[PDB]
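ping. complex inputs:
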Amino acid sequence: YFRDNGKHALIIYDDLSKQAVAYRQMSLLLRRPPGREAYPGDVFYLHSRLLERAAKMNDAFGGGSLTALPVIETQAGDVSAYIPTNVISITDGQIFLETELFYKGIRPAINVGLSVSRVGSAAQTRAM
Amino acid sequence: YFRDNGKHALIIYDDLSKQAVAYRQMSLLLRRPPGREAYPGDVFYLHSRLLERAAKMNDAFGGGSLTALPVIETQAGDVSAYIPTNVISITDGQIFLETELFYKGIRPAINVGLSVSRVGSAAQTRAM
Amino acid sequence: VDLEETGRVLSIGDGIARVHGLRNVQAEEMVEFSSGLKGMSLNLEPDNVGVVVFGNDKLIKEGDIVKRTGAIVDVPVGEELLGRVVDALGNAIDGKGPIGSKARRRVGLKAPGIIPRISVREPMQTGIKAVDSLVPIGRGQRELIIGDRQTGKTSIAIDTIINQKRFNDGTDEKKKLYCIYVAIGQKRSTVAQLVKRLTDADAMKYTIVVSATASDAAPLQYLAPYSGCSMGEYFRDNGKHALIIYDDLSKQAVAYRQMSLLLRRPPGREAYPGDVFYLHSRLLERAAKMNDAFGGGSLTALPVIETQAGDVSAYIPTNVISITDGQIFLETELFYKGIRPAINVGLSVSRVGSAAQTRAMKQVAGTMKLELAQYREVAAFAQFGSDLDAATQQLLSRGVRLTELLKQGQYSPMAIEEQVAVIYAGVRGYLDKLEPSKITKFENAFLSHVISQHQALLGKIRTDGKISEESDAKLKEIVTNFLAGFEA
Amino acid sequence: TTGRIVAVIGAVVDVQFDEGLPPILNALEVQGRETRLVLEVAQHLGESTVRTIAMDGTEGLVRGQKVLDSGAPIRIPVGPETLGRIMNVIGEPIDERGPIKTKQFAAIHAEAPEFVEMSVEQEILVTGIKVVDLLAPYAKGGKIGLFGGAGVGKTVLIMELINNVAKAHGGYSVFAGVGERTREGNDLYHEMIESGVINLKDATSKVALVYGQMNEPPGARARVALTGLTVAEYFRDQEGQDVLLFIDNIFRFTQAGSEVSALLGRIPSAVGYQPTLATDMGTMQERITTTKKGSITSVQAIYVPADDLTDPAPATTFAHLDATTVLSRAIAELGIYPAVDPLDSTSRIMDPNIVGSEHYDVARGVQKILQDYKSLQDIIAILGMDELSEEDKLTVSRARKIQRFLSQPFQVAEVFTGHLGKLVPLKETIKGFQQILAGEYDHLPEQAFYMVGPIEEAVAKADKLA
Amino acid sequence: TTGRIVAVIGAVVDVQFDEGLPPILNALEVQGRETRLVLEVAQHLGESTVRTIAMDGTEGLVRGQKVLDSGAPIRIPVGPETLGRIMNVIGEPIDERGPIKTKQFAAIHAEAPEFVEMSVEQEILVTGIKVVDLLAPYAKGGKIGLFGGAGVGKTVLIMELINNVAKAHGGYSVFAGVGERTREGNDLYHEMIESGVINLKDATSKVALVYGQMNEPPGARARVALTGLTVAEYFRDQEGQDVLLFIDNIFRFTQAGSEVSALLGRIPSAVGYQPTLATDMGTMQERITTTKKGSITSVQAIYVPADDLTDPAPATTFAHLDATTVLSRAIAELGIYPAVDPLDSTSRIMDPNIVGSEHYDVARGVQKILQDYKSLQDIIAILGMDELSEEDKLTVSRARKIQRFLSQPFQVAEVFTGHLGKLVPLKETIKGFQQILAGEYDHLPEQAFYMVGPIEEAVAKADKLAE
Amino acid sequence: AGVGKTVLIMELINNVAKAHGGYSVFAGVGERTREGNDLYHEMIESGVINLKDATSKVALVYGQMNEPPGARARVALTGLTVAEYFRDQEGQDVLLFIDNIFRFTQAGSEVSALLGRIPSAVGYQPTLATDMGTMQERITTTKKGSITSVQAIYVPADDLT
Amino acid sequence: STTSEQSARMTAMDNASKNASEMIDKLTLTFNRTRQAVITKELIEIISGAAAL
Ligand SMILES: Nc1ncnc2c1ncn2[C@@H]1O[C@H](COP(=O)(O)OP(=O)(O)NP(=O)(O)O)[C@@H](O)[C@H]1O
Ligand SMILES: Nc1ncnc2c1ncn2[C@@H]1O[C@H](COP(=O)(O)OP(=O)(O)NP(=O)(O)O)[C@@H](O)[C@H]1O
Ligand SMILES: Nc1ncnc2c1ncn2[C@@H]1O[C@H](COP(=O)(O)OP(=O)(O)NP(=O)(O)O)[C@@H](O)[C@H]1O
Ligand SMILES: [Cl-]
Ligand SMILES: [Mg+2]
Ligand SMILES: [Mg+2]
Ligand SMILES: [Mg+2]
Ligand code: NA
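pong. complex structure:
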């Protein structure tokens, strides 16, 4: 609504891991053929169609935007798991928060080397 | 009968792994739903019904007893397998036997660190 | 209402036609739809017939007639197939005139029993030193090739075909070997490049190429090894010798799984059917060595299987290992280290053994297979730089330089005598003092020298098929005087 | 003639026909929609009913809704007028530039070229990327596959190959966006307008764009790959021209197949996939090839789910390729970009007869010293580099200097790296790694080789440090 | 009574009867066939219909084709006229030497011997194989099982046991070739004719062959194991004689069950197998036994899919065995043949009261030094040999020599080894591993123990390696 | 057990009943009938249970292991309802001891299987998060009072993930 | 030499303890992911065969 009215919105899905679990529940009760971690084939499509709707519109459409900050919960830092890679493969970068850094006192516990922004520099002020 | 009528008894189930396979065969061919390792949902209900009937009676009902020594064959040391996971949690204690200890010269090959009796000292004489 | 020789399609989808009627149809019988496509009647049920479709199912529709052939699936057979590239049903697909052979043979015939066979003894020379010495193949034997992607599996098969040219230009009929290469699930550009390779070395003239590529339907990929087997079984039963290469049976198993799953047959292990072992067992058993009473011909098989992460202890690899008479296991670790061909010595075996070798090779590579297995055990054991006795450092010194001899390039397979010559130097201990890195240089200089001057000695080993005490003394004089030149 | 919807579930819609049953693969028009909703016939169920896969969302569909037989498969515009234009699965223009006025059309389901039509000539294609050119080089008209896990450099790599080849390549191109990001499509479109390869004023465009991205439902992602081919199949056959065919990402074809197959009600294969994974891939992939009539050089980005190359989707794809550039997260995390595995990447032209014996020896020499270094990784992980012997430490120091010299700054990734983009010729690619193997830079440090073009820059970078 | 075929899906064939419905296990004869085609009734589906499994290939079968009921299960030839001849699953000759000239037949299905029929004798049977005799020796009148993955020496071992034990044996024998290689059937058949164990002319043949190989469909492989043991059951009870019952491979009985299980309308059990694995194995394996009336010494080759001994098939087989010889690919990979796992193979008779304390104490000493070495291997690969104690690297050197002295060149395996075949007596086996344990050959090198018969050959070979 | 687990429970019952004026509840989710006997009589002898007068500081709710999956599934909810009285109706800060919470998950996995629902990853019920969530969200603070809960965690295979 | 040696060993074996410690964490998590995968994948086979009759 804000995107398609020349305004700027921010959305935070907290968290898409729990949503995926809920969709696995619905899928397995429907007796649909499961796969990795018992998830269905469209668990990628679940998140892909959601996060695709976060966009930056042109001036002809109003110049509005919807910015997405989805959340995922990894098990012991495993970024290579099914659902983490699925959402990594959808989004335009990541903010990896490492548990070892949180324990020391580095807070917020952002790993710099692992974290990426794919369209970042363009949307960053000349001062910074 | 021995337990009820004052006396004490000892029972050895050798083994509950093979009993579970027999019960699984029936449950699969009666088309009951197969769970983990193809066993039915009432496989814990099966072994817990059996093992709970072993008991130390008080003086009023007799004073007698029935003592269970069930056996469980693990596969490649996997004590976390479905049927071993059941009978471990049901029972009052475990005597873990391992292949590496057996051929090392530890015979009987009982793991002291992992084996446990939750009753413990209460079933010992002051000498021991 | 005559729905005995004819029948109507109830439903078509994913290559599985369900046919009403056809009361008098047989199991595994070929049938023909309205459009002209062929089908196979694999499921006979009370109210329908499950027919697997050889081709694109767009041509089949509901209410289409299905006529009986009255015959089991069968393919063309004979000498006219040689030099030609065909598909799973023997139809020519190389821009040339069609297959004009008069004889014909069934695809799904059972293998010969105990009495028609005789034990394996005639050598089937691959021209690859690591195979011929360590894991020798005989005529009628079944030797699996196996390993990860790009480990050199097909390359073992190519040289084995190209090595037969030396024999096939001669006049002796029992010396000849007519090859077959069944391509299951590959792409057409790869099979085209493979045929180009054989035609450059003039190998096609005695080679039949059966091509069930990825774009072809699952039944054609399923059928193609059995079709090519029946083309080889013609040579076998009429007193001639043939080779066949199923490249590969993993891609065949995927095709068979698709048919079986879409015929609503409950799948077993890893989604494959219960009878996935039986799929490969009945194919390979047909490759055999016949006795003199049945003409004395043979069919030698070389199936290929793909592994994942170098795991020979997996369900499908172990199935095909449990059928075949040994295997040649390749590894990516050994490949990139320079060990090419990348044959793991311990994991590879041959179950005919020295019975399938010549007497010459039996002398020089008699106890070489086991000695090389112990070398890798001892070399891996003493990786740390500790002191060792003279007997174990000799085993390491020997084993390193034997491995450098068994290295070999491709598109240049060696004759049995020339293999015996180069293996002599290593096993009899002349290489031991030289540096490991110069062993490949030694071999090339030694091989080109014996080809130049000593054609009588190489010829005498080829004629006799052994190393005499005369020839032993000549080689002893040649290598010792050669070694003194190299060491300086 | 006319049909009626009987059931609907996701992308799978069943349609009954009173008279005249439509054959398999025919496009069916749903009557009464704002946009055009195409249903493609997948099966005949029986009792005059056919199962179909929709090319757009099935929301709004009611049982008994009218459906027409188009009388053919999904036909699209193909020709010179497709260049400089974007189109969806069904050939509709999606760039707000009106009709695509072509003279011909073409069905997206054509049978693949027969064995008779196969070319066998393998000519090398110089990329400018060292690991590719050195170890697993591409061939002109060859099938090229870029395997990669989530976020390791597939799209960066395929966009670098567009920059190096497509401009230097005097011929047409095709980019088929199969199930990736719609904003990346916007990035491609407006990059190509600004660069010159697409021209809005003129008709001098060198690229035709096709797009069915991860916002689209499964039936669309499953067919959009084929729509991209059909455009490239015209330029190959009907003009006799050399073609580039970029596809990002061909995994989404097979992923989408898993989504429809579930709803089609089949028994699944291993890892929850469709039982037709290999045959669906075959009929698609065999059309992507260089025939006798014309040349298609095809670069396919291949997503690897959960970094697992043993997964059925990537595992089957290997067979359909002439060169494989296998990316790695392990290599990416250590800073080496592009993150190519030199021991898991292969090419069928890596042959001393084709590339020349000097090339082959330097490639296999690099792979030997890399594989020797890999075998020591269990011992180096625990104790360290210092605990090894003098012979073993020398191979490690060279291998690490090789691994860093295998890295290179890309022109498309100047924002990420910071370094200026480089494109190393084939002569200096062989020469650089040839010197390192001989041991002419054992004295130089490791990080001097990290992110440099030719071997000359490795000496220049090392001198500034001291 | 006459019936009609109603369905054919692979080896599974459904048959409908109007009047007389045949019971389970009954052999049904299919008419209109050139060769004889038996169908054994497995289940009753209902509606006057029964589900069967075919003993030969089903190709050519038509719906409505006539099927007669024999009124009995599969009955095969039994008696001393079977000796020298090769049978198949349904009791026909496959050797081309006329009919099996006997007028007495036995059904392949039968109840296993009762508990009262069981014997408890267990005297040692010395094979001449060092690793087997030392660590996990076999017993006369006892069940022996040869486990192993694909290509580790199960057949090479079982043939060597036939070479060593069966030739020097007064009583009869039976080799049941269940679901393995027709080539190996040919090899055995003509090798026994050479040695005079089978004689084509006179009636002095000791072994009776039975074969249903991997060229056959599942019904054949699922029942040919039973066929073979029914021949041995006659030689046990009716004769009263020591029978040797070799089986290769008894996994194929269970495998053949798993191939058809889906088509019989069963939910699969763990790892794709039938629910009826243990009960089907039980009614078969319990018949393979020694009783009061006669002694059977049964050697059975047991395949292990994917080299995983936890697999339902081999996992269930262990309990049926008195002695177990487990083979490993890991050991065969190093050249150590026979590739027996010394820390996995076991026997019931390994007791100081049965084989004596001097035998027992050496066998455990070998297992200890090998087991202690197995733990070290992984530690000393990283941290190096020089960190070990002098007591440890003594036990490392001794262990590696003991591993090699467990290896042995077989006569049947002469074509693979390149070394002459050797049979080591039990006395010289025990003394050999006694001396190596005590440290009497610590001065001698490592490779002298590899691939030799007695301990004496190590001393001689050690001097040969000097030059 | 054997590290003062049952002693720690009893003291938490004792101390919270004294200071905060809040009673407790014990829910034996898969109680070993032998250990149900021991916990009952140890609570009597200590003082937290009183048999003669009404100064008892715990309600006990046992769903023993020999009972079917339906029993062990819902026995946590039964004891939770006893705590809901003291919170809602009488405004107390209540304790709810659940032993064992893995057996609540396990009993749910058995029930789901029996009904014919297809299992999820590692054999657990597809409704694992909801079955947990519908129970755990009742254990919370309200304006009336609260229900705090000590829960016995069994980690299968020593795997936290 | 020996005062440097004992310092150099104490340093290297402190790193060898930390490296092995992080490898236990990596391997223990890989063990569990494989453990759960084998239980899941085996269960999918049973359900696939059961809902196909
Ligand atoms: N003996 C050899 N010496 C040198 N190079 C070799 C040798 N054998 C194979 N190669 C090379 O290794 C690569 C793979 O060979 P190939 O025979 O295609 O293996 P493959 O396993 O059949 N490939 P694929 O079936 O596609 O996984 C080719 O580029 C060959 O040139
Ligand atoms: N004792 C031995 N000595 C030398 N070589 C051996 C020995 N045992 C096995 N081999 C080698 O390994 C091969 C496999 O032996 P074999 O007995 O056929 O294994 P298997 O376990 O019976 N295979 P399968 O029945 O297919 O599961 C032999 O043909 C030899 O080449
Ligand atoms: N050559 C390179 N130089 C510098 N950075 C790179 C390079 N390649 C990849 N990256 C980094 O990795 C990120 C993701 O790369 P990308 O090209 O999106 O790979 P991908 O596999 O296509 N991603 P996805 O589609 O989400 O799986 C980029 O935004 C860069 O930060
Ligand atoms: Cl003794
Ligand atoms: Mg190949
Ligand atoms: Mg990308
Ligand atoms: Mg065998
Ligand atoms: Na590079």
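The longest strand of chain A covers residues 8-11.
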